[PDB]
Amino acid sequence: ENFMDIECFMVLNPSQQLAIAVLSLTLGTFTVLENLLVLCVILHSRSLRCRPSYHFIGSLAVADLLGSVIFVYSFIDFHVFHRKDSRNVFLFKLGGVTASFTASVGSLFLAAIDRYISIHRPLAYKRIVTRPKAVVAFCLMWTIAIVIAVLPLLGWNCEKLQSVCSDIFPHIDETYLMFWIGVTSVLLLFIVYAYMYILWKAGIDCSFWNESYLTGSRDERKKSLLSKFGMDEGVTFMFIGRFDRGQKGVDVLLKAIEILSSKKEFQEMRFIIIGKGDPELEGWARSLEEKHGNVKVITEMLSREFVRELYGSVDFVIIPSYFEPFGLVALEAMCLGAIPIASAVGGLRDIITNETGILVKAGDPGELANAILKALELSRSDLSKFRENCKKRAMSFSDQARMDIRLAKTLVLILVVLIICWGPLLAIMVYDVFGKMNKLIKTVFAFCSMLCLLNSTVNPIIYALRSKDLRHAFRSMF
Ligand SMILES: C[C@H](NC(=O)C(C)(C)Oc1ccc(C(F)(F)F)cn1)[C@@H](Cc1ccc(Cl)cc1)c1cccc(C#N)c1
């Protein structure tokens, strides 16, 4: 019942032991060293240590140290001095490794929130994820992890319970594992949805959402567009988005157009409503079209390059959202000098300032209907400054997001590697508890074990490869 006995898992040559013993210490010590080094680096760096976005690195590196140091201690403690492990020492050793894995998952979860918020709320992030808060998140996350890991030492082992002990690990209760694997498994799933959501929905293409693809005068482009829809020249508001309830507020906008409809000012305005969803709001929106010929609806799926021609041409872009994950429409629109009239939600709060657009109360056709009116009076002066102000700000945001989406991808990589190393092993462990174990499989377990250590090796290296800032902070020493 000794920890890290490869021998209950397979019989070895003296050669293979020799080989393994050498790959083990040399790798183990190596992996201990580089993860120390990672720590000694971020802790000497003012920049790194107490920046929230890089807090997971410090957390992974104690996570990788915890397991690697326990690998190498346990190995020495067994194979060199031949001390043998009591229940509680064994359990403390295993508690060390689970704790490390939990904390790894803990760190990617807390990082994944850090990334969402950094892109969801680019300004407000800096006051939402603050240094003291960041630390308290990590401490809690670590104490939970440590707490879950010590449970077997307080009696949730199979010994103090007398319940079926696992085939795989001595001194431990099988369904305690299931708890521990399940917590971590589901939490992995949410971390993956999370990162995926961020990566499919976040940011824009600054190579494509760019004024420079358009030739001419805005006026000329506007007039040409407007005649393509057989309307005369007139202030042109665009909506593009899902037709739906309580999400992208085309229902709010269709209310606002009926408010204005009677006004004299309305005949001065032009509405281009683009999108699809509810058959009802389409029915409604189509009726407003056949009612007024200064309204124009498009459910026909539209060319992205045309949507850029639109952003390039219309005066205002109307974003009546109840919810806006990453404010893409706004950012694209403004990049091309469309001034945004938008609900004051998510990042729209951070993005639109008083010198770049108009904000309203979500859900309110009256606050919108007036916005539009203020926007039609605003358009009696010149809007060049506004569209210019819009362009840069959006650029700034677009870039910041490109940075923060990069740090996100690093963490996806770190995740993918982490699922890869540990994925097989937990599958096997679940497989072990449930069902029946083999004696081949028992070996590919022991083999897969080492990928736990391997993961701890490669994490420091991709920090190194993937973040200049880590790299530069390390050169600050020598
Ligand atoms: C490599 C360890 N595997 C084993 O102890 C078993 C499963 C007996 O197989 C082996 C396989 C190889 C070795 C050897 F000789 F290379 F060190 C020792 N044991 C594994 C055991 C393990 C325990 C708990 C979890 Cl959740 C995962 C793996 C472990 C031990 C200590 C630190 C880390 C890390 N990072 C990983």
Numbering used by the authors: 100 to 301, 1001 to 1196, 333 to 412
In the authors' words:
The endocannabinoid signaling system in mammals is comprised of the endogenous lipid messengers anandamide and 2-AG and two homologous GPCRs, CB1 located in the nervous system and periphery and CB2 expressed primarily in immune cells. CB1 is the most abundant GPCR in the central nervous system (CNS) and regulates diverse brain functions and behaviors, modulating neurotransmitter release and neuronal excitation through pre-synaptic activation of Gi/o, GIRK channels, and arrestin/MAP kinase signaling. To gain further insight into the molecular mechanisms of cannabinoid system modulators and enable structure-based ligand design, we sought to crystallize and solve the atomic structure of the human CB1 receptor. CB1's orthosteric binding pocket is highly hydrophobic, as expected for a lipid-activated receptor.
To promote LCP crystallization, we replaced the third intracellular loop (ICL3) of CB1 with the thermostable PGS domain, which recently proved essential in solving crystal structures of the human orexin receptors. We incorporated the point mutation T210A, which was previously shown to stabilize the inactive conformation of CB1 and increase thermostability. Finally, we truncated CB1T210A-PGS by eliminating the first 89 N-terminal residues and the C-terminus after residue 421. After purifying this construct from Sf9 insect cells, we obtained LCP microcrystals that diffracted to 2.6 Å resolution, solved the structure by molecular replacement, and refined the structure to Rfree 0.23. At the extracellular surface, the second extracellular loop (ECL2) and membrane-proximal N-terminal region preceding transmembrane domain 1 (TM1) form a lid over the orthosteric pocket, which almost completely shields taranabant from solvent. Taranabant makes multiple contacts to both TM1 and TM7 and fills the orthosteric pocket directly inside the TM1-TM7 opening, potentially acting as a ‘plug’ to block endocannabinoid entrance. Taranabant adopts a conformation in which the chlorophenyl moiety extends toward TM5, the cyanophenyl buries deeper into the 7TM bundle, and the trifluoromethylpyridine projects into the putative access channel between TM1 and TM7. Of the 24 residues within 4 Å of the ligand, there are only three polar sidechains – D104 whose acidic sidechain points toward the extracellular space, S1231.39 near the access channel that forms a polar contact with taranabant's trifluoromethyl group, and S3837.39 that has been implicated in agonist binding. In contrast, a large number of hydrophobic residues (including 6 Phe, 3 Met, 2 Trp, 3 Leu, and 3 Ile sidechains) line the orthosteric pocket and make a variety of hydrophobic contacts to taranabant, burying 1109 Å2 of surface area. The major divergence between CB1 and CB2 within the subset of binding residues lies in the membrane-proximal N-terminal region, where F102, M103, D104, I105, and F108 make van der Waals contacts to taranabant.
